[model samples]
Each structure stands twice: as structure tokens, then as C-alpha cells.
Target chain A: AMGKKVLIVYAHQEPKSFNGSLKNVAVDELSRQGCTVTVSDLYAMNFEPRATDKDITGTLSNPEVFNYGVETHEAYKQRSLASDITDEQKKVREADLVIFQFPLYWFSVPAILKGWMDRVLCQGFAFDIPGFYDSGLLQGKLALLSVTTGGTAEMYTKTGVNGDSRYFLWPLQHGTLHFCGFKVLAPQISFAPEIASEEERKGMVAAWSQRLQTIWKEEPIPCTAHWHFG
Target chain B: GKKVLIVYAHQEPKSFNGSLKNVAVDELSRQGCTVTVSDLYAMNFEPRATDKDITGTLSNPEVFNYGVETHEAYKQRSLASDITDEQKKVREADLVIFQFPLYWFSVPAILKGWMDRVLCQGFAFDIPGFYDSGLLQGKLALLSVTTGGTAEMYTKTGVNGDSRYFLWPLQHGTLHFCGFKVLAPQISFAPEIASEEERKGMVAAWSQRLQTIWKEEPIPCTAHWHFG
Candidate 1:
């Protein structure tokens, strides 16, 4: 629990709105718990989450493309690989616990987060052939999802407006984090964003703060061999 | 009066997004609302995060979260005259609408970059607490999207639940997270083979829905109020 550093990525287009408060409060509360906390206000930094033409081609420099269907042009990959987008890669490696805090859009992460993953979490790094479970480099690290929903929590239930026990996080939690061997913490969602009362808002911040404080020491779901290999 | 900003993103302006853009313009204009449109592809926008933004140094986690600005070369490009104008439109808008054809179930790269560049920290979600209150508080948002799958494929128990499955990120995660009163999206299935009649019907249905939603609030608690 000591020396544990938590990275909270607050991603939202409009910051002066509700999400900004949520980010600040969470950061403050977590800080009070004698732990190191970080926030990446994604929009403020102007995160480019999309993979550029150069990024796509960079990976294809390999003799063979390991990822099926996703295109990788050899010539382009060669030129891009020479240049390298390694700095972002370093940030990912340094963090002990990574939390994605953002608003839900059309049932997924915002364009920026997706763009961030597309560019930052590229091949030779965030994923690969042996990317399933224990064999990955990101093992032992932890991943937590701190999200806000405009709809009420009830609306996301099996019989609500969205229907089903929300499993929209496959590509990120399962396909990305779990594939990388990071023990994923159950996500914390702040629902009914457009109408969350003041008390509810405060409760969310407190809840998230507690989670972040204990996240590092929390037991991770074992990365078993039975898990599907990509 | 409600001002709507439609950030239209597509690689080719001459393609289906062209018609979708036109429909949005016409639909919102006739409803007595002034609309601002940003055509990302026509602008040849770049979608790369610059160096300074990646941060060579580390500090408070919160500081790291609200990243720094672009470097000189990229900053110049980000703040170009026309792009600045589009940023202004996003600020003035009462209702922000993102119109596009779903590409891999997300916004096109250029359009996504527009958010990275334009929705700057202080203006969008930094110093003050926007997340707790809902980021795009007073503004409303609706997604008018098109897809390549047929309607039958986007069902509860259909094969793969194809089209509906694709909407998870856009509708639930992105728009709603920002605090916009997101309305039910309008989707036109299988745009490549949509018959003229089918396209016309979709256009009409979309137009009527937008018109009715003008005075109606999608989220009840926020009705007749600037924000919930």
C-alpha cells in the first residue's frame, strides 16, 4: 500500500462541467489517504488517441503482421518504426496502477481515449500474439475504470434503458488490459450524470477515493491459462 | 434559442457523410436554431499528440492528468485561424451534435483529434469541477449516425447483435460521459446498399425526430432548465 502511485486519466471534452468536479474531488480525497495520486486531464492536454497513417505503417515493418484483419502496410511500418513513438510507451510502463476516468459516449470511451489507445497502445507494446493473461509484460500492474454515465445506474441494469449487465468494456478491460496481463479492478461508474444530486456526486467521489487508496493492495483476478488467448 | 454545432467527420466529404451533413444543416436550420458545422476531413486535420503534451517531467497526479499545451510547431497548427473559429463555435453552442458514419464504432481520427485540440483543459474541464456536475452540463447532444450493417443485425438476440453492439462506445461511453442530454441515436443501416426510398424515409424520420426534440428534453430532470 505504501509508495503506491495511482494514475487517474480524466478524459472529457468539456471540463467545466460535472466531470471536472469529479476529477478534482477524487484526486483530493485520494491524496488525503497518504498515497500518491495522478490525474491526466486528457482534453486539457489535447490527447491524440488515433493511430496516424505513420503509426499503422510503423508496425507493418515486421516481416509478418501478427494482428489479423487490422491492416499493417510494410513500407509505412518500416519508416514509422525507425522514428518510434516510444515516449508514451515509457509512461505506460512506469505506472503501477492506471485508472481511466471519463464520460460514456454512445456506450464507449470518448474519441480521445480511443485515439489515445489507438496511437499510444500500439503493437510491439500494449498487445501481441502472447498477449493473453500471464505471459505479458504489464502483469502485476493494476487497471481500474472510473467512469461517469449520463443515464442512471438503474438504466444500465439488465432490464433498464440500456439493458443487460453492462459489458461494453471488452476491448479495453478484456482485450486490452487483461490481454496485457494487468489485474483489472472492477470498474466504478458514476451514473445519471445529467441529474446526479449533490449528495450522490459527493458519494461517488468518496467511493472512488476509497477504491483508489486500496487498489494497489487489492487482490487481482488470477490470469489463468484457461483464459482465451488472442 | 438553441445553437447546435455539428462536428462532421469523414475521410471523404463527397461520400455519404455529405448527405448526412446536408440533412443535419437543413434539419436544424428549419427548426429556427443556428447550426455550426466543422468538416474535419475537408480541413485535413492532423490527429497526433505533440511532445510537450507527453510531458518530460512528472508532478502532482492531477497536474499530470490535465496535460500541458502543444509545442511551437504543433501549437501553431492547432491554433490556426479556421480551427480557432471552430473552437469558438463549440463554445457558443447550446446543443452540440456529432454527425458521422460510425467507423469501427467510433469517431473518425481527424474528428477525434479536433476534441484533443479544441476541448482544451480550462475551457472544457479543468480548474473547476465539471466531472461531478456533468461536463457539457447545459448543452444537449444527439448522435445521427449511419452504419454498414442491416437493421436486423442490431437486435437483442440477433446474430452478433451487430449494429447495436457497435453503438456501445459512442452512445453510452463518449456522449453520456460528457454530461450531454444524449437522445436516442438515429441510425441508417447498410448505407452502401440503402435504396433511395429507404434513404428518403430515414432522412424524413431523422428530420422529424430532431424537430420534435427541439422543445422536448431528453432527460427529464433537466427539462426547461439550463442543466439538471
Candidate 2:
């Protein structure tokens, strides 16, 4: 754990929000373990969230028509992907663990972070058609989501107004992350900090900081329907 | 005359998603409905939520809280012209249909951006009445989506789990949270790999559905319907 490399792909626009505290706390705790940490502050970077032809640098594989996934897949093989994509990919490739820190937008990552998954984790880069799931390219890596929400934990229960929180998490964790072969850690959900008392927010932050102390010893969730649905 | 807004997000005009969009336009127009298509890719709609979205002075110049600033900007009518323009369409719309190819089990980034930027706090929802009592209470929304996976692959026992699992966020979380009655989604699965006849049939099914959409009922949009 001493020499482990960590990458935090953070996505909150405001640096002073509760999400900011969680991100900052993570860095401090991870740093204490003599770890090398890199933070890609996407909002600060003004990361482009749209996936289009601009993502491919050189020529289109099919000049007549544009299939973004296909074009970018070929580009990945040719090393002709846009500099920004390659830059992010380089970080993803080297990191032992990737912690996605963001406020839940529309029950998923913000569009900017979604675009990162779409553009950066292309076919050749993240997973091949017949080589997904357990055989995915990023199989050895660990990925965790640190999410903040606008609703209360009570609202996310099975009998609550919003249904179970796991219902919303199925797509991002199982479909996207697990499909790409990342061993998925149980997400750290900071529920409804906007409405919480100052002490409650601080408690959430402290909980996360403490969790990082033994993050390396944790096991990934099965990331299956039974796990998420049940 | 019911006003419909179709926020389409596929880049290629000739793509399968485009076919679905065209059919909806034709069918809805034939039914004497006023249809407006915000073809997202062609318009190059901005997806990133940022300070630029608020045109004038920010409430706090030191720290930009998107939700706070956008809420204030919307009240002041100082939101970026594009966002305001989309808001106008939403405000006037009786039904909003989102058309797109599913990317990573969700709508493409451009379409997601439309959601992020256009559905501001003061406009789509507010503290006064959010979720089940939202501002857009009488309005309706539908997701017309195309998928990369087959119907079987999206089943509960399948690798991706049930298709409804992915729809919960868009239908219940976003649309329902904003007070829109959620219509059952029109999912055309694996259109790219389907035979020409199968693809045409799928398009026809969509066109036919719009014929009686006015008579249709909203899904339960609950945990039981989606997860059970």
C-alpha cells in the first residue's frame, strides 16, 4: 500500500461544496500512506463532455459516415486519439485505483464524467466486444464511486419515494464499470448534504477519511443483479 | 393542439436514431400536434454545466455553485441565451420526448447536457415544489431510446440486468422529479444489427404508438415495476 498510485477523477463545479471536502479529505488520507495521488479536476479542466469526430485526431476510418465508437476504436489502435483523451487514458492506465468523486446528476455521473467514460473508455481501450466483463482490459484495476446526493437516505429505500438507491446504481456500476472489468468497490454515498447540518456533513467527511485508512484491504462487490437488486 | 418537443441527440442524420426521430415527427405532425425537434448534435448543444451558463453577475463571484447560480440567473433571466432558448421550448411544451442512442447504458452526453443545462432549479423544479409536485406537473415526458444490446441481454438474468433498471434514472429520477408524468419508454433494441425489415418494423411500431399516445397512461414508475 505504500507505493500504490491513486487517481481521483473529481467532477464537482464548485470547489467549496461538501463534495470538495470529501475530495480534499481523500487526498490527505491517501497521501498519509505514502501514496502517489493524481486528481483530474474535470470541471476545472473544462473537460469536453460531448463525444464527436474531434475526439479522433487523424483520418476517419469510414470517411463517408461517422460511427463515433468505431472511429475512436480505430483511433485508439493507431494512437491518433485526441491529446486530452490520451492524457486521461495515461492516468487511468497507471493508476492502481480510480475514485470517481461527483454529485449524482440525474441518477448518474454528470454528463462531463459520462463523456469521459464514452470517449476515454472506447472499444479497444476499455473492452473489446467478445472480451468484456471478467475478460475486460482493465480487469486488474479497482474503481469506486464517491457520490453526493440531493435526496435523503430514507428517500432511497425500497419503500421510499425514490425507490432503492441500488436501483439507480445498477447501470453505472454493473453495466459500465463492471463491463469494463474494474473490480467495483462499494460506493461511498454522502446523502443529502445540502440539507444536512454542518456537523452531519463533517461526520460524512470524517467517515470517508477513516475508510481510506484501510481501503486497500477491502474487497470488491460482486457487482451482479442479486447484489444490486436485492 | 398539444405541443411536443423532441430533443434528439444522434450526430448522424442517416443513423437508426434519426429514422426514429423522423417517424415521430411525421406521426405526431399527422395527428395535428405541433412538433419541435431540437436536433442536439446538429445544433451542437452545450453539455457541460459551467459558470458560462449564467450570463450576468454571479451571486457569489468567489465560488460558483451551479445550482445556486443557475437558480438565481433563471429568476433574473440572465441565463445563457441557449439555455434560456431551451427553457422557452420546455415551458411551452406539453410533452417532451427525448430521442437518442444509449451510451454506456444512458443517454449520450449531448442529450445529458441538455438535461443538465436546460432543467434549471427555478424553471423545471424548485424548493417550493420539487418531485411529485414539480413546476411541470401537468406536462408529460417520454424517452425514445435505441440500444446497442439485444432484448435478451437486458433481461434481469442477463449480463446488463433488466432494461427497466437503466430507465429508472431517466424516467423516475429526472422526469418524475421534475413533475412530468412518465410515459413508458419506446426502446428499439439493437437496431444497427437488426435486419432491414426488422428495423423498418421497429420504426413502424414507433409511428403507430404515437397514433394512440394521447390515450396511453403513464407507467407506475416505481421500484416494484422497475426492479421487481
Candidate 3:
């Protein structure tokens, strides 16, 4: 824990919002535990989310046809990716754990953070076709999603209007993170802080701090569809 | 006549997603449904949700809250032209179809940016006004997504899980949350690997669906429907 370098990739427009509070607490707690923390404040950075040819630097691998996945994978192997992508990749390479902090945007990470994944986690850097799942390039590192929601917890139940919360999380937690081979810690979902009382919000933030203190000791979730769906 | 808005997000027009988009436009037009395709990649649609989304002023100038400011702007008619332009299309459409290649198990960043910026609080759904009672309840939404993975790989017992599993967020969270009666997703799995005839069949399948799209009923759009 003392030697851990943690990266918290955060996406929230306002510093005073509930998401900000959760992010600050995680930083404070992890820092207090003697861990070095780096925060990628995406909105503040005005981080680009669109996956375009501009992400690659000098020469076009195939200028005639621009397939983002193929081109970026080539760029990653050649170290010709944009500085912003390489900068984040460097942080990811150095970190023991990567935490994504954001309020739910369409039951997924904000577009900015998704762009971070699309651009930074290129084929050679994150995972390859035969190299995904347990054999992924990032197999040993840990990932966690610290998410806030607009709906109540009851609404996220299996029979609730939103179904199970895990239903919404499958693509992100399993398809993206697990596919890339990171051992995923169970998500820290702070449900509906927007409608909560001041004390309830504080308690939720406090709970996150408490969890991060023992985060290193936690094992990865099974990350199976059955585990999520059932 | 019924109106349809297809928010198409793909870089290459010669690609599989492009074929699907063309077929959708063609078939829907043949059916007498007025079709408007927002070619996001060609338009280089702004995908980032920043202060720039609001044209005139800030709701909270110091903190810069996107959701709050955008909500206010939407109400005040001061939102960015790009966002309002898309909103107007959504507002006028009877059905909205998003055609794109799947990136990281969801919509590409450009299309996701559309959902984030265009479907603002006041425009799509307000506080206590989402889910079944969402503002766009009368509209129908469908996700016509292309994936690089095989169909078998996306099954319940497979490594990637069911294709429906990956669709929950787009279909249930975004579309249903906004009160759009979500039709079943059109998942053209691994079109890149499919043979020419199969690809043609897939495109034909979509075009065929569009012929009778107005008569189709939306799925249950529940957890049971997605997971079980």
C-alpha cells in the first residue's frame, strides 16, 4: 500500500458537485496511506473524446483508409500516438490501481473518459486479439469504478425500473475493463447523492474513503455475466 | 408522414457501418418516412461536453456545472447550435436510430458525446421526469450497432457475454431513461469478418426491418429482458 502509485481518472464538470467530493476523499485517503496519486481531470483538461486520425502523429500507416482501431494500434506499436494519449498511458503503466470516477452518463463513463479508453488503451498498449482476457497486457494491474448515480438504489434492483445496477455496468466493468485483463475490484457505487440529504451525502463520501483504505486487500470480482446477471 | 432521425457515427462510408446506414436511409425513405442522417464523423461533431456547449452565459460561473448550465441553456434557448440542432431533430422525429460501430462495448465517443450533450436535462429528461415518464416518451429509439466480435462470443456462456448484455446501457439507461420506447437493438456482430453475401444479408435484414418498422413494438426493456 505504501509503495502504490494510484491513478484516478475523473470526469465531472463542477468541482463542487457530489462527484468532486467523492474524488477528493479518495485522493485524501489514498494520499494519507502514503500512496502517490495522479488525477486526470478530463473536463478540466478539455480532453478530446472523438477518435480521429489526429490522435496519430506524423505518418499515416494507411492514409488512404483510416480505420481507428488498426491505425491507433499501429501508432501504439510505433510510439507515434498523440502526446495526450501517451501521457495517460504512461500514468496507467506506472499505476498499481486505476480508478475511474464519474457520475453515470447513460449508464457508462462520460464520453471524455471513453475517449481516454479508446485512444490510450490501443491494441499494443492495453490488450491484443490473442492477448486479451487473462492474458491481457494489463492483467496484473487493478481497476475500480467509483460511480455516482441519479436514480435511487431501489430503482436499480433486479425487478426495479432500472433492473439490476450490474446490468448497466456489464459493458464497462466486464466488456471493457475485464476484457483488457485488469483484475476488477467491486465497484464503489454511491447511488443518488444528488437527491440525498447533506449528511447522507457525507456518509456516502466517508464510506468511499473507508473502502479505499482497505482497497488493496480486496480480491477481484468474478466478472462473469452470470455473476452480474444472476 | 412519420419522421426518423438516424444519428450515424462511423469514420468510413465504405465500411460496414456505412452500408448499414445507407440501407437504413434508403429503406426508410422508400417507406415514406422522412429520414435525416446526422453523419457525426463527417460533420466532425463536437464530442466533448465542455463550457463551450453553452453559448451565452454560465448558470454558476465560478464552478462551471455542465448539467446545470446546459439545463438552463436548453430552457433559455442559449445552448450551442450543434446541440440544439440535434435536439430539434430529436424533437421532430417519431423514431431515432443510432447507427455506429461499437467501441469498448458501447457507442463511439462521438455518438456518446451526442447523448451527453444533446440529451440535456431539460431537453431529454428532468429531475423526477425520467424512466417511464421521460420527456421523449412518445418517441422510439433503436441502436443499430456493429461490433468486431463474433455473435457466438457474445452469448451468455461465451467469454464476452450476451450481446444483449452490452446493450443495457444504451437501450435501457439512455434511451429508456429518456422515455423512448426502445426497440430491440440491431447488433450486426463481426461484420468485418462476415462474407460478402452475409454482409449483404445483414444489410438487407436491416432494410427489411425498416419496411415494417412503424408496425413493430418495442421490447420490454427491463433487466429480465436484457439479462435473463
Best by TM-score: 2
Candidate 3, residue A103: lDDT: 87
- The residue-by-residue lDDT of candidate 1 on A1-230, one tens digit each, is 65556677777645555677677766676677765776666667766554444444443433242321133223223434313344445556777788788776445566667666555654446545555345555776888877777568786654464443344654456545775677888777888656777897778777776766566568765432112111
B1-96: candidate 1 lDDT, tens digit per residue = 678898887644455666777877898898788988777756656554333343234233333333344322233444445446665787689887
* Cα lDDT tens digits for candidate 3, B85-126: 999999999999999999988888989999999999988998
**Sort by DockQ, top down from the best:** 3, 2, 1
The deviation in Å at residue A177 for candidate 3 is 0.9
Interface RMSD, in order shown: 9.1, 1.0, 1.2
Selected candidate, larger lDDT, 2 vs 3: 2
What's chain A's TM-score in each predicted model? 0.77, 0.98, 0.97
- Superposed Cα deviation of residue A113, candidate 1 (Å): 1.5
lDDT of 3 at B189: 82
Task: Indicate the docking level reached by candidate 1.
Answer: incorrect
Q: Residues A63-166, candidate 2: write the lDDT tens digits.
A: 88898878998999999999999999999999989999999988888989988888889998899988799988899999999999988999898878777889
> Which residue runs does candidate 2 get wrong by more than 4 Å?
none
lDDT of 2 by residue, B1-228 (tens): 989999999878888888899989999998889999998878888899999998898899987788889999999989999999898998889899999999988989888888888998988898868778888999989999999899999997777889888998898889988999999899999997999999999999998999999889988766778878
Error of 1 at A65 (Å): 15
What's model 2's TM-score?
Answer: 0.97
**Which residue pairs show backbone clashes in model 2?**
none
On residues A79-159, what C-alpha lDDT tens digit does candidate 3 reach at each position? 899999999999999999999999888888888888888888889889997899888889889999999988799988876
